[PDB]
Amino acid sequence: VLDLGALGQDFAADPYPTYARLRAEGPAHRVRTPEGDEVWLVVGYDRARAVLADPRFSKDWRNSTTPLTEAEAALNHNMLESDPPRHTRLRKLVAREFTMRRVELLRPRVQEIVDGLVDAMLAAPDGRADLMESLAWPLPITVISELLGVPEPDRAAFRVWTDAFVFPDDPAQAQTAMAEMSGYLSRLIDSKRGQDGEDLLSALVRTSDEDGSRLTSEELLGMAHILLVAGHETTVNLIANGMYALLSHPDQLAALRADMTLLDGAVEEMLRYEGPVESATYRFPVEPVDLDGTVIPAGDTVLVVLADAHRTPERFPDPHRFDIRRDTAGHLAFGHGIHFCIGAPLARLEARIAVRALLERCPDLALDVSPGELVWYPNPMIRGLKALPIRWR
């Protein structure tokens, strides 16, 4: 049992040499997380990709030997914490909302949001700002909030609850937060009921009312939760981590600023090199699974380490090089298999717009701090910064 809490901020900041040295010793390893839970890491690209798609590794908490808390059990009837056939049905509900076509329709508004956020940011008197406060955070919360129908006065609460259960001081504190947000969401579902809003939460509340067999009240709260947590948190971190990647590689920043057709590939390499999902969501083996002689017990918690997958040199040569022109095909930053990210085109749309606007409107854009002054969150599932100080000319 490697104690990841004991490794401290050095591991949070640069966990890669740790995964890589585990990977050399075998595909799977028992570790304790900073919070105190024993889990399994699965490392190495080929094994990570296999495990992600393998039906022996379930997402349904009934297959876990760790009981849900009260507040969590209110929230688990969502597609990411389901297996077929419930998974199949939940995913089909919101299928269509996230295609490249429906997301294309959002390009104008996404642009307008960024255009505005970037205005405000430039109005800074000394040409200095924290990219997280100025753009990384507000852009995704705003986009997802409009989609779902979270009214403007309530959106502030989401950062706090989200930070609370994504990065708490104690598990006891995430509980309260989740209860509180879940409390909020029920009340927001109830407020939509038969009120004829055109947002997705109203469309879903409709579905549940019409045919509570296609969608239960509980699945309604779960779906609302899930769409909110990805639509801001991971996307915020893609934006901030990928900009950090660009800023700390002055050479690749110049290369993209010189040629914007390089943009889609740059965003892919930011997903590869500094993706916000360090480790995929909990997997639970239905039966014991032997991984090249290392047997994981049924019901244990298994974290597939996407970050280590992406530094696997036989898959991504010279893995420690951030190279915007690199072949990134087949990366796992949006997962793999039947739980593959539904929001991937939206995440991509937002990041691409945000990066282009920063490069085009912030002259001599640069990191305003040294890498050693950055603070990364210890949660082994999320790769993310506390602040990103930037400056421009």
Q: Is 177 annotated as a binding residue?
A: yes
| CA atoms of 68 and 125, how far apart (whole Å) | 49
C-alpha angle with apex 126: 122 to 132, nearest 5 degrees?
55
Residue nearest to ligand QLE (CB): 229
Q: How far apart are CA 33 and CA 5, in angstroms?
A: 6
Give the C-alpha distances (Å, rounded to integers) separating 309 from 5, 168, 272, 322, 383.
22, 27, 9, 15, 14
d(CA 146, CA 245): 29
**Encoded amino acid at 311, one letter:** R
Query: Of the two residues 64 and 252, which places its CB atom closer to ligand QLE in the complex?
Result: 64
Question: Residue 44, Cβ neighbours under 10 Å: how many?
Answer: 24
Can you tell me the distance from the alpha carbon of 298 to that of 305, in angstroms, rounded to the nearest whole number? Answer: 19
Question: Residue 229, annotated ligand binder?
Answer: yes
Residue 249 marked as a ligand binder: no
202 binds, among ligand HEM, ligand QLE, none (CB under 5 to 8 A by kind): none
**Least CB distance from residue 78 to ligand HEM, whole Å?**
7
Tell which residue, 145, 117, 141, has the closest CA to residue 131.
Answer: 117
Please work out the total of residues on this chain that contact ligand QLE, with binding judged by CB under 6 A. 16
Q: Which of residues 46-75 bind ligand QLE (CB under 6 A)?
A: 72, 75
Indicate which single residue of 224, 226, 245, 359 sits in contact with ligand QLE (rule: CB under 6 A).
Answer: 226
Query: Minimum Å distance from CB 273 to ligand QLE?
Result: 18
Q: For residue 335, state whether it binds ligand HEM (rule: CB under 6 A).
A: yes
User: Residue 91 binds which one of ligand QLE, ligand HEM, none, with CB within 5 to 8 A depending on kind?
Assistant: ligand HEM
Q: Could you say whether residue 13 binds ligand QLE (CB under 6 A)?
A: no
- DSSP 8-class letter at 28: E
DSSP state, residue 96? G
Per CB under 6 A, the list member of 28, 221, 266, 341 interacting with ligand HEM is 341
Phi, psi of 303 (to 5 degrees): -110, 120
Among 281, 317, 371, 373, binds ligand QLE (CB under 6 A): 281
The answer to whether 80 contacts ligand HEM (rule: CB under 6 A) is yes
Q: How far apart are CA 104 and CA 119, in angstroms?
A: 23
Q: How many residues bind ligand HEM (CB under 6 A)?
A: 26
Q: How far is the CB of 284 from ligand QLE (least distance, A)?
A: 12
10 Å CB burial of residue 194 (0-12, 13-18, 19+) is exposed
| 260 marked among binding-site residues | no
Residue 229 binds ligand QLE (CB under 6 A): yes
Q: How many CA atoms lie within 13 A of 248 on its CB side?
A: 19
Residues facing 129 on adjacent strands: 390
Q: Is 204 in the site for ligand HEM (CB under 6 A)?
A: no
CB of 12 to ligand QLE, least distance (A): 14
Please tell me whether 226 is known to bind a ligand: yes
Q: What is residue 373's DSSP assignment?
A: G
Sheet containing strand 302-304, edge to edge, reads 2-3, 28-32, 38-42, 302-304
**Residue 235 within binding range of ligand QLE, rule CB under 6 A:** no
Q: Does 226 bind ligand HEM (CB under 6 A)?
A: yes
Nearer Cβ to ligand QLE (29/283):
283
| 81 belongs to an annotated ligand binding site | yes
Q: Which of residues 227-286 bind ligand HEM (CB under 6 A)?
A: 227, 230-231, 234-235, 238, 275-277, 280-281
Q: Pull the structure tokens for residue 150.
A: 């979270």
Tokens of 356: 């282009």
Q: How far is the CB of 381 from ligand QLE (least distance, A)?
A: 4
Does residue 163 touch ligand QLE according to CB under 6 A? no
Q: What is the sign, positive or negative, of the torsion defined by CA atoms of 170, 172, 176, 181?
A: positive
Best CA proximity match to 280, nearest among 55, 40, 4: 40
Q: Which residues bind ligand HEM (CB under 6 A)?
A: 52, 79-80, 91, 98, 226-227, 230-231, 234-235, 238, 275-277, 280-281, 333-335, 339, 341-343, 346-347
**Which residue numbers belong to the known binding site for substrate?**
81, 174-178, 225-233
* Residues at the site binding ligand QLE, with contacts judged by CB under 6 A: 72, 75-76, 80-81, 166, 225-226, 229-230, 233-234, 277, 281, 381-382
Annotated binding site: which residue ranges? Answer: 81, 174-178, 225-233, 341
